[PDB]
Design a protein around this ligand. Sequence first.
Ligand SMILES: [Cl-]
Ligand SMILES: [Cl-]
Ligand SMILES: [Mn+2]
Ligand SMILES: [Mn+2]
Lengths: 182, 183
Amino acid sequence: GNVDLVFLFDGSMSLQPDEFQKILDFMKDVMKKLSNTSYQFAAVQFSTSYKTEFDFSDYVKRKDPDALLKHVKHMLLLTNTFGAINYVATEVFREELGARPDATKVLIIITDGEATDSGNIDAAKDIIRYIIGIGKHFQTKESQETLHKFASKPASEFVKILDTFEKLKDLFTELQKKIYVI
Amino acid sequence: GNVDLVFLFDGSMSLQPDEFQKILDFMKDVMKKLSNTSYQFAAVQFSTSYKTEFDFSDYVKRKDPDALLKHVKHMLLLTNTFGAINYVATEVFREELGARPDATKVLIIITDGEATDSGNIDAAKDIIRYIIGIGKHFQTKESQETLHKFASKPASEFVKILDTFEKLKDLFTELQKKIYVIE
Ligand SMILES: [Cl-]
Ligand SMILES: [Cl-]
Ligand SMILES: [Mn+2]
Ligand SMILES: [Mn+2]
């Protein structure tokens, strides 16, 4: 059926220009591969606060990813992941913003550090959540574990730990192996 | 005889990751085709500032283009072309870094926008300079003309204007047609 997918991407101070761009490129990669399908997208940048870079309606209006993400400006602040996920659940997955009531909601969270806030993401639990943790800040098993609470279960399936930003291309190569005409 | 060639590549903010990658791929194709010859290479990324990604010595120690360029990080800043060329002439073409004294010096400058700086490139005049301007920013003849000052003469020979980054593939195809075993 229809799938409404939101890319919630980290725009923290830790990110170097090329790493940030690499996060954005993975997003573009997935979009252009899934162009003209039942998939519809929205992208939200999060750091201390949040910004819907383009919503579902924007996407359908002009499906071009490079264009849709042209005005993105790296926030360079903190990593308030709990608030960010809640913002997506209540402020992005909305009909007035182009979300289809029927669609399966999917969230792809991309981050390079532990959340700088706390609370709960109860309001977003019906959304299928994937989280990609990248870089040195996720060197230890402990840091990696902290991400499980944001993603769907099992974590072995929904949580992806990447050692480098370059590995995003690797991740894209693998996700494509899972594309099928059904 | 021996040829010391430096690729001076644009790492400005305008470039999309795949566009930057195409510039890198062109460089790798040229290097691979010219492996085990009298050519030795060095690569320098320029934007607001410069970074010798690998020097002649690095190339001699390890010829693998992929390995040599694997640590390149897109700068995503300005386009100080005058400063970059001067940097190549005075900080890259040096025996200290593997350059061969009486080798023919060649520079292949690749860019997608007009220079954000000014001055002169007198320090680099004895280097055979080629320049490839790519994309939307070189739509007008006026913009293409601003690149003449950086390249050797005639411009008809040293200045290449490409409308797309995909066109770098055709350029590689063209240059290969000029490859000969010189007697
Ligand atoms: Cl951070
Ligand atoms: Cl630029
Ligand atoms: Mn961070
Ligand atoms: Mn540029």
